[PDB]
């Protein structure tokens, strides 16, 4: 059968609709300032794919990269929180939760669903913002504290274009993003 479209589970299966243009909504804000002020190592986030499922639900993939490589042994837990979607929390790593879905907390991807409803214009909607909660050097990972050299060990990194100071420093750590409604690439 066809594999042009990514298939999704359906209330059954359905054809995903891939969005062609995934736009950083605020690439001229300074995001680094907000991590630097908290002594958090800089990270970046990109949205690398968006597929419309149905309704206003999209399956998105993110890619998160730290400035320096931090070995997995330092990590205790990693989760996406505050998600506007089917699941409000997406566990990525945690011994307590038997979850091992990444192998490098400084270079990882994650795929999850969001409800994207706030219009940019008549064709495009914003990603709803979320946070990524990192806990290093807790539990069993505390034993590696003597070689830790990357600053603050437990922190949340947030997305968005809607929170910045009067000098263009973001109060978020990562940009917000937008894409076409229903991933209809012919809108407009
Ligand atoms: Mg698709
Ligand atoms: Na629909
Ligand atoms: Na956003």
Curated annotation (Swiss-Prot):
Source organism superkingdom: Eukaryota
Annotated localization: Secreted, Cell wall; Membrane
Paired cysteines (S-S): 19-183, 26-161, 123-187
Record note on what altering residue 126 to D does: Disrupts homotypic domain interactions
Modification note: Extensively O-mannosylated.
Residue ranges of domain Flo11 in the record: 13-188
Record annotation: effect of changing residue 178 to D: Disrupts homotypic domain interactions
Job of this protein: Homophilic binding protein that enables kin discrimination in heterogeneous yeast populations by mediating homotypic cell-cell interactions during flocculation, a reversible and asexual process in which cells adhere to form aggregates (flocs). Plays a role in cell-substrate adhesion, haploid invasive growth, diploid pseudohyphae formation and biofilm (flor) development. Adhesive activity is inhibited by mannose, but not by glucose, maltose, sucrose or galactose.
Family as reported in the entry's similarity comment: Belongs to the flocculin family. Highly divergent.
Comment field (misc): In the reference strain S288C, the transcriptional activator FLO8 contains an internal in-frame stop codon, leading to impaired FLO11 expression in this strain.
Entry domain remark: The number of the intragenic tandem repeats varies between different S.cerevisiae strains. There is a linear correlation between protein size and the extend of adhesion: the more repeats, the stronger the adhesion properties and the greater the fraction of flocculating cells.
Protein name according to UniProt: Flocculation protein FLO11
UniProt organism field: Saccharomyces cerevisiae (strain ATCC 204508 / S288c)
Lineage of producing organism: Eukaryota, Fungi, Dikarya, Ascomycota, Saccharomycotina
Gene name as annotated: FLO11
Whole-protein residues included: 30 to 206 of 1367
């Amino acid at each position: 059968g066809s594999s042009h479209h990514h298939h999704h589970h359906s209330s059954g299966s359905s054809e995903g609709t891939s969005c062609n243009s995934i736009v950083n909504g605020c690439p001229n804000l300074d995001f680094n300032w907000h991590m630097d002020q908290q002594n958090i190592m800089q990270y970046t986030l990109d949205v690398t794919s968006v597929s419309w499922v149905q309704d206003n639900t999209y399956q998105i993939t993110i890619h998160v990269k730290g400035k320096e490589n931090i070995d997995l042994k330092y990590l205790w837990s990693l989760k996406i929180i505050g998600v506007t979607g089917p699941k409000g929390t997406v566990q990525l790593y945690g011994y307590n939760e038997n979850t091992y879905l990444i192998d490098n907390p400084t270079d990882f991807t994650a795929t999850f669903e969001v409800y994207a409803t706030q219009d940019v214009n008549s064709c495009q909607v914003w990603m709803p913002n979320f946070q990524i909660q990192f806990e290093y050097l807790q539990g069993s990972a505390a034993q590696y504290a003597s070689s830790w050299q990357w600053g603050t060990t437990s922190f949340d990194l947030s997305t968005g274009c809607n929170n910045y100071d009067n000098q263009g420093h973001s109060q978020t750590d990562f940009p917000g993003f937008y894409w076409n409604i229903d991933c209809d690439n012919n809108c407009g």
